[PDB]
DNA sequence: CCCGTCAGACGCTGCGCCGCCGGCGGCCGGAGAATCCCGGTGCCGAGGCCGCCCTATTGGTCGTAGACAGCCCCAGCACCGCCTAAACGCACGTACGCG
């Protein structure tokens, strides 16, 4: 089997794979819906793009 | 002759004119003092590149949040009538305010 990054699978650049781990250790919740981080990383890329 | 009336000239008063002076205002010239570029020079640090590995991704699972399906029932909403305090309009005037 071959693996592909999730960021590409969303057509995104920011590290969905990394940021998902952050909420897991961030203790904001005990369980995270897998859909949430993909949404989250998308937001940041929009925000960062807006400023520069 | 002088007074009296009216008339005419004088003196005084009020005015504008007249010239002077001042002040003001405006406008400008140009010094000149900064800022502003403009070009020459040289880094050091982006940026770029390479090694590498730890984490991200994959497969599987399993068990449990949570949907959802259904349900009861409070209590939020209508509305209805009677009441009056509460709101409203104006009427001054003086006092904050603004210059």
Swiss-Prot record:
What GO cellular component is one of the record's annotations? nucleus
Q: Which cysteines are joined by disulfide bonds?
A: none
- Asked if the Swiss-Prot or TrEMBL record annotates the protein with the keyword Nucleus, the reply is yes
Q: Name one GO biological process term.
A: heterochromatin formation
Chief location of this protein?
nucleus
Source domain of life: Eukaryota
Select a single GO molecular function from the record's annotations and give it: structural constituent of chromatin
Modification N6-(2-hydroxyisobutyryl)lysine, positions: 25
| Sites of the Glycyl lysine isopeptide (Lys-Gly) (interchain with G-Cter in ubiquitin) crosslink | 2, 4
Per UniProt, the keywords (alphabetical) are: Acetylation, Chromosome, DNA-binding, Hydroxylation, Isopeptide bond, Methylation, Nucleosome core, Nucleus, Phosphoprotein, Ubl conjugation
Summarize subunit and interaction data from the UniProt record for this chain.
Answer: The nucleosome is a histone octamer containing two molecules each of H2A, H2B, H3 and H4 assembled in one H3-H4 heterotetramer and two H2A-H2B heterodimers. The octamer wraps approximately 147 bp of DNA.
The similarity comment for this entry is:
Belongs to the histone H2A family.
What is the protein name stated in its UniProt record? Answer: Histone H2A type 1
Natural source organism = Xenopus laevis (African clawed frog)
Instruction: List the top taxonomic levels of the source.
Output: Eukaryota, Metazoa, Chordata, Craniata, Vertebrata
Q: Which residues of the full protein are shown?
A: 13 to 64 of 130
């Amino acid at each position: 089997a071959k693996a592909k990054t999730r960021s590409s699978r969303a057509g995104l650049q920011f590290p969905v794979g990394r940021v998902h781990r952050l909420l897991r250790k961030g203790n904001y919740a005990e369980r995270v819906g897998a859909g949430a981080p993909v949404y989250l990383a998308a937001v940041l890329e929009y925000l960062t793009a807006e400023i520069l």
